[PDB]
């Protein structure tokens, strides 16, 4: 239902571990969905290539991001540094939850995170925009390179892009 799919190749140390496509619910949350879509294609002058999952915790979530202004942002939006959410439709009631990372409300639009587990303690907070439709096994494989403190023993970069639309 006018849902864009964003496709990536997930690579550990540059070596393709697999590939993950995410269904963006643009019919529900058009702002936060098209935001990440325009980051990944980079038509807004950003071109998010090689996006490194540098912050991953097992039994929780695998979070990716970029080197551009890594301090305090590290993966800014088409709204720039940070923006406020459109509407809190999509709750974190499932696995593979693709949602852009934040410190809180009006601080969304810096990096992204994929909740490998159903993180329900993230309800009443920043809304989801997409979910892993294919490659959830690769997402939980990324999780296995992460550490409890947020450390990543392996350098998991988004090798390539090419959204299925």
């Amino acid at each position: 239902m006018v849902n864009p799919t964003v496709f990536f190749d997930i690579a550990v140390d540059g070596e393709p571990l697999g590939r993950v496509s995410f269904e963006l619910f643009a019919d529900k949350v058009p702002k936060t969905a098209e935001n990440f879509r325009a980051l990944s294609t980079g038509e807004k002058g950003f071109g998010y290539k090689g996006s490194c999952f540098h912050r991953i915790i097992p039994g929780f979530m695998c979070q990716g991001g970029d080197f551009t202004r890594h301090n305090g942002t590290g993966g800014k939006s088409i709204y720039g540094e940070k923006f406020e959410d459109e509407n809190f439709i999509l709750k974190h009631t499932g696995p593979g939850i693709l949602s852009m990372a934040n410190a809180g409300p009006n601080t969304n639009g810096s990096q992204f995170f994929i909740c490998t587990a159903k993180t329900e303690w993230l309800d009443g907070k920043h809304v989801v925009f997409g979910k892993v439709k294919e490659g959830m096994n690769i997402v939980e494989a990324m999780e296995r390179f992460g550490s409890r403190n947020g450390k990543t023993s392996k350098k998991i970069t988004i090798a390539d892009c090419g959204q299925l639309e």
């Binding site: 912050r55 305090g72 410190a103 990096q111 993180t119």
Partner: peptide, 9 residues
């Protein structure tokens, strides 16, 4: 201590 969610005390 960064833009990102938390869990696991």
């Amino acid at each position: 201590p960064e833009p990102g969610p938390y869990a696991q005390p």
